[PDB]
Amino acid sequence: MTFVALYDYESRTETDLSFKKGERLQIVNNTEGDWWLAHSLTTGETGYIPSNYVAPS
Amino acid sequence: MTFVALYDYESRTETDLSFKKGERLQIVNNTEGDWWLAHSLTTGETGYIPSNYVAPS
């Protein structure tokens, strides 16, 4: 439900949240799912993906 | 381990991976953890956060 930031984090893109240690955060439900860092065996490209867009082999 | 893309996805930032339905993807281990959409109760701002930076209340 509710979480506390353990460290400062500075945003690197337009979509991430900057926060300071000690902030209280609540998880937002959304249709994309959690995001995972992934490597495409098909294209060789690498980056974050929305987990609801994929399924186990 | 290995996953298959169920849908096309077009990148929206410099860090996400674009992929087509059918691509084979493998999860990359990294120090940040999975990313979650979160709302800061402290600042009112909202965006994605690295899960390894937070802990349950």
From Swiss-Prot, chains A, B:
Tissue expression remark: Expressed to high levels, and with a high degree of kinase activity, in certain fully differentiated cells such as neurons, platelets and macrophages. Isoform 1 is widely expressed. Isoform 2 is expressed only in the muscle.
Residue ranges of domain SH3 in the record: 2-57
Modifications the protein undergoes after translation, according to the UniProt entry: The phosphorylated form is termed pp60c-src. S-nitrosylation is important for activation of its kinase activity.
Compartment annotation: Cell membrane; Mitochondrion inner membrane; Endosome membrane; Nucleus
Function text: Non-receptor protein tyrosine kinase which is activated following engagement of many different classes of cellular receptors including immune response receptors, integrins and other adhesion receptors, receptor protein tyrosine kinases, G protein-coupled receptors as well as cytokine receptors. Participates in signaling pathways that control a diverse spectrum of biological activities including gene transcription, immune response, cell adhesion, cell cycle progression, apoptosis, migration, and transformation.
Family under the similarity heading: Belongs to the protein kinase superfamily. Tyr protein kinase family. SRC subfamily.
Assembly notes: Forms a complex with polyoma virus middle T antigen. Interacts with AFAP-110. Interacts with GJA1 and PXN.
Protein name: Proto-oncogene tyrosine-protein kinase Src
Protein species of origin: Gallus gallus (Chicken)
Name of encoding gene: SRC
